[PDB]
């Protein structure tokens, strides 16, 4: 289904907890830095993390 | 588009060698009522007799059939290559022939009896009524006796 797992949820949370000023709300500009900041062994996985990072970025933007 | 005047000469039935042959149907498929001549044989005998294929069994003259029956009786006379006939190289004679309305059962009895008299495997099978062409009798053929 649409739900994502811990391996992308904690990875996205860990990146934001550490790399907050380096990433931003847009997925495309977040993909380019996620694959160079964190060693991600899969194209599909790195896509998932970048999507959950920008998702929490939108939530952080409001409260 | 071609249209004809239909008279009383139309024959609702035809008498070919003591068998009732239907009128009001195609001549090619009317002759199939004879035992021994069917769709292909009627096609050939009608080609040899030069009868219009589009015409029915109604407007056919007596001469048109008399050649048709003559072809049926003696096919090898009209230079037939001996692969249309149903009885080639008869065991009793060795000469090319072709069975008739009543001859097909007579020779079928004759060719079945010779197997019976020699007590062959085929002959004892025909005497038994079981399958003779190797068909398994385990599954098929229960409601037949």
């Amino acid at each position: 289904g649409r739900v994502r797992t811990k391996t992308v949820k904690r990875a996205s949370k860990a990146l934001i907890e550490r790399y907050y000023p380096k990433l931003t709300l847009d997925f495309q500009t977040n993909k380019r830095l996620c694959d160079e900041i964190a060693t991600i062994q899969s194209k599909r996985l790195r896509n998932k993390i970048a999507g959950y990072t920008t998702h929490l970025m939108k939530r952080i933007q409001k409260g | 588009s071609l249209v004809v005047q239909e008279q009383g000469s139309f024959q609702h039935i035809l008498r070919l060698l003591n068998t009732n042959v239907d009128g009001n149907i195609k001549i090619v498929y009317a002759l199939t009522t004879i035992k021994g001549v069917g769709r292909r044989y009627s096609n050939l005998v009608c080609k040899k007799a030069d009868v219009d294929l589009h015409k029915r069994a109604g407007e056919l003259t007596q001469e048109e059939l008399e050649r048709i029956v003559q072809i049926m009786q003696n096919p090898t006379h009209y230079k037939i290559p001996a692969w249309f006939l149903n009885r080639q190289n008869d065991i009793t004679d060795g000469k090319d022939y072709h069975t008739l309305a009543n001859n097909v059962e007579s020779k079928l009895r004759d060719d079945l009896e010779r197997l019976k008299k020699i007590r062959a495997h085929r002959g004892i099978r025909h005497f038994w009524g079981l399958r003779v062409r190797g068909q398994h009798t385990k599954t098929t053929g229960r409601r037949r006796a």
Binding site: - | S1, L2, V3, Q5, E6, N24, I25, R56, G58, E59
Partner: protein
């Protein structure tokens, strides 16, 4: 022994296939007032043979009384000009 059959009745259809003057001039005088004329229309109204229906249809278009609109096989759609 049971054979599991129904064996319904029959209507004993009498489709004539060699047409005489009585049928020939009947269809000729009755091809008008027929909005839709086809092979099955002829046999189910003038009780002619199936091959007669298509042959007669070819005759009615050769001279020309019934004007065809669709010349497809397996379904012939002819109307009458007015």
């Amino acid at each position: 022994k049971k054979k599991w059959s129904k064996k319904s009745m029959k209507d004993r259809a009498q489709h004539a296939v060699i047409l005489d003057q009585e049928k020939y001039d009947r269809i000729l005088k009755e091809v008008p007032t027929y909005r839709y004329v086809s092979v099955s229309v002829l046999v189910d109204r003038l009780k002619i043979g199936g091959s007669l229906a298509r042959i007669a249809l070819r005759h009615l278009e050769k001279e020309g009384i019934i004007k065809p609109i669709s010349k497809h096989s397996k379904q012939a759609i002819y109307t009458r000009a007015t």
